[PDB]
Amino acid sequence: NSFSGYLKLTDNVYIKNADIVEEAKKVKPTVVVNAANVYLKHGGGVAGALNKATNNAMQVESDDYIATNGPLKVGGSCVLSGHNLAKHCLHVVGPNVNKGEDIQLLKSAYENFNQHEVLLAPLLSAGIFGADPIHSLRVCVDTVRTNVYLAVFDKNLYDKLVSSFL
Numbered sequence: 680n681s682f683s684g685y686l687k688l689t690d691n692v693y694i695k696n697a698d699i700v701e702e703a704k705k706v707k708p709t710v711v712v713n714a715a716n717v718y719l720k721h722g723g724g725v726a727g728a729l730n731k732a733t734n735n736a737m738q739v740e741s742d743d744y745i746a747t748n749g750p751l752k753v754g755g756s757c758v759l760s761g762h763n764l765a766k767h768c769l770h771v772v773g774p775n776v777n778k779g780e781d782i783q784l785l786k787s788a789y790e791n792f793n794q795h796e797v798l799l800a801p802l803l804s805a806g807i808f809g810a811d812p813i814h815s816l817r818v819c820v821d822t823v824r825t826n827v828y829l830a831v832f833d834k835n836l837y838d839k840l841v842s843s844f845l
């Protein structure tokens with residue numbers, strides 16, 4: 680495939696210090712993962728950045744999805760358009776520790792990735808979702824069996840994740 684400059688962590692997990700919006704514009708992957716909430720309200724974090732890069736088309740599509748189907752579950756997902764960034768966007772809901780959600784749901788959230796042969800993704804439940812990113816990377820490698828390319832935006836976080844990976 681066309682992903683370049685990634686560090687191989689395992690047989691199927693790769694990682695790079697990159698902005699997932701810029702990686703998606705360059706690669707045009709079949710699937711880009713969004714770090715969504717149950718309402719698909721893409722205000723901040725990686726969801727806000729991806730939505731802004733679509734000129735708000737992601738949010739307009741998402742509002743129609745919620746009006747028809749109701750909210751997602753924590754640990755769940757839905758497949759929507761990738762707009763100008765990818766063929767599809769897999770919106771995955773990891774638990775948000777800052778909302779008091781159970782971190783135990785993180786493994787269920789990563790299991791959604793196994794439905795897609797290859798994905799470009801951020802770390803679930805990290806950043807403003809409040810979980811320990813070292814734990815999120817461990818759950819990712821121990822749960823996902825398909826090929827995942829993780830784009831870590833924060834440079835200091837990337838360096839910490841590499842140096843502490845077992």
Ligand SMILES: O=C(O)[C@@H]1CCC[C@H]1c1ccc2ncsc2c1
Pocket residue numbers: 697698699700714724725728801802803804805806807830831832833836
């Ligand atoms: O990799 C990170 O530093 C965090 C961890 C969890 C969400 C990631 C994130 C956040 C915002 C953002 N904006 C553009 S790419 C991008 C990616």
